[PDB]
C-alpha cells in the first residue's frame, strides 16, 4: 500500500510551485477530474516533509504556497475562474490541514485509514490562521470580480426590459458563475455565501436605480419587479439554494415593489405601509411615494398629507437618514470545516501536469 505522501527534492521546490500554482491552468481537463487536486498534492507534500521531521522544508513549502497564490491572483485576479479556482483550493488545503491535523475535533467524519494519515511532527495551527486570512482576501476579490461582471446587466435586466441585457442575461451569468464554482469543488456552504452576496448586490443596485430615476415607480413596474424577483427565486430553487439567505437580501427591493402596488390614500393605508415596510428606511418609503406615477386617469398621485402621516407614524424609528443602499457592503465570510472522503493513498497525479519529479510514497 501507499502511504498517501509525496516526496520532492529541495532543489525542485520552485519548479513544484511553478507547475502546481503559478502556471497551472484551471480549465485543464486534468484538474476537472479531482476538484481540489492542487490542494491535495500540496498537503501530501507537507505530509512527507513532516514525516522527515524537516521543519525548514515544511516552512519553505508553506510560505512558497501563500506567496505563489498571491502572485497568481495579482496577475490574473480579474478572471473569475482563476479567483474561484484558487479560493476553492485554498479552502480545500485548509480543510486538509484540519482533517489530518490529529486533533480529534476534526476527525469525526474520518475513516480509520484517513486517521492513519495525520501529521505526526508539526502543529500547523498558526499557518491555518494565515491561510484562512488569505481565503478571506481571495473571497473579497471574487465578490469584486462577480460584481463587475453583473453591474452592466442589472438595471436593464431588472428595470428597463419588460451587447444587450435582459433578465435572461442575468440568469445565464448566474448559471455560469455557479457551474464554475461547482466544477472547482467549492464548498457548498461557501457557494451559498457567494450567491447571497450576489443577490444582495442585484437588489441594492436595482433599488438604488429605482430611487434615482423618475420613471420606475408605477404599479406596472411593481408587477415587473415582482416577476423578475420570482424568476431569481426560481433560480435559487433549481440550484437548491433556498436556505442560502439570498432571497432575504432582496427584501428592500421586494418591499419597494409591494409599496408600488398598495393603496395610498387613507389612514388605514398609511398604517399598512408602515407595518409592511420594515426593510425600507423612512427616506426610501417617502421617496417612492413621491415618485409614484398613476396608471391612468382613474388613479391619482400620493398627497402631501399622506406622506406627512407616514413620517409622523415612523417618527420614533432608529431610522438611518440614508436614501441609498450601500451596494458595496460585504457580509462577513466563514469557511466551516468540510472534510472530504478522498483517500490520499489512492490519489494519482495526472502525468499531463508536469510533476514527474515528485514521487509517490
Amino acid at each position: 500500500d501507499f502511504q498517501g505522501m509525496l516526496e520532492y527534492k529541495k532543489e525542485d521546490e520552485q519548479k513544484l510551485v511553478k507547475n502546481l500554482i503559478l502556471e497551472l491552468k484551471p480549465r485543464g481537463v486534468a484538474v476537472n477530474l479531482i476538484p481540489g487536486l492542487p490542494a491535495y498534492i500540496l498537503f501530501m507534500c507537507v505530509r512527507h516533509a513532516d514525516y522527515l521531521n524537516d521543519d525548514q522544508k515544511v516552512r519553505s513549502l508553506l510560505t512558497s504556497t501563500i506567496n505563489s497564490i498571491k502572485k497568481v491572483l495579482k496577475k490574473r485576479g480579474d478572471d473569475f475562474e482563476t479567483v474561484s479556482f484558487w479560493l476553492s483550493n485554498t479552502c480545500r488545503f485548509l480543510h486538509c490541514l484540519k482533517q489530518y491535523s490529529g486533533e480529534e475535533g476534526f476527525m469525526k467524519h474520518n475513516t480509520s485509514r484517513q486517521n492513519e494519515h495525520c501529521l505526526t511532527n508539526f502543529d500547523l495551527a498558526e499557518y491555518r490562521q494565515v491561510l484562512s486570512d488569505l481565503a478571506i482576501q481571495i473571497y473579497q476579490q471574487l465578490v469584486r470580480v462577480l460584481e463587475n461582471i453583473l453591474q452592466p446587466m442589472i438595471v436593464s435586466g431588472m428595470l428597463e426590459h419588460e451587447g444587450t441585457y435582459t433578465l435572461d442575461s442575468i440568469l445565464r451569468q448566474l448559471n455560469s458563475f455557479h457551474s464554475v464554482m461547482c466544477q472547482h469543488g467549492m464548498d457548498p456552504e461557501l457557494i451559498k455565501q457567494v450567491v447571497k452576496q450576489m443577490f444582495y448586490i442585484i437588489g441594492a443596485i436595482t433599488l438604488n436605480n429605482l430611487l434615482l430615476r423618475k420613471d420606475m415607480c408605477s404599479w406596472s413596474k411593481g408587477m415587473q419587479i415582482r416577476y423578475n424577483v420570482s424568476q431569481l427565486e426560481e433560480w435559487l430553487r433549481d440550484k437548491n439554494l433556498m436556505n442560502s439567505g439570498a432571497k432575504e437580501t432582496l427584501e428592500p427591493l421586494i418591499q419597494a415593489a409591494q409599496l408600488l402596488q398598495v393603496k395610498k390614500k387613507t389612514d388605514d393605508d398609511a398604517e399598512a405601509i408602515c407595518s409592511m415596510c420594515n426593510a425600507l428606511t423612512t427616506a426610501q418609503i417617502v421617496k417612492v411615494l413621491n415618485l409614484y406615477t398613476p396608471v391612468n386617469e382613474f388613479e391619482e398621485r400620493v398627497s402631501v398629507s399622506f406622506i406627512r402621516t407616514i413620517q409622523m407614524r415612523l417618527r420614533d424609528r432608529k431610522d438611518s437618514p440614508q436614501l441609498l443602499m450601500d451596494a458595496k457592503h460585504i457580509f462577513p465570510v466563514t469557511f466551516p470545516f468540510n472534510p472530504s472522503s478522498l483517500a490520499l493513498e489512492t490519489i494519482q497525479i495526472p502525468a499531463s501536469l508536469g510533476l514527474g519529479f515528485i514521487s509517490r510514497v
Partner: peptide, 12 residues
C-alpha cells in the same frame, strides 16, 4: 506531542 511551527510576517 507535535511541535508548533511558528508563522509570522517575516517568514513570508
Amino acid at each position: 506531542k507535535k511541535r508548533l511551527l511558528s508563522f509570522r510576517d517575516v517568514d513570508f
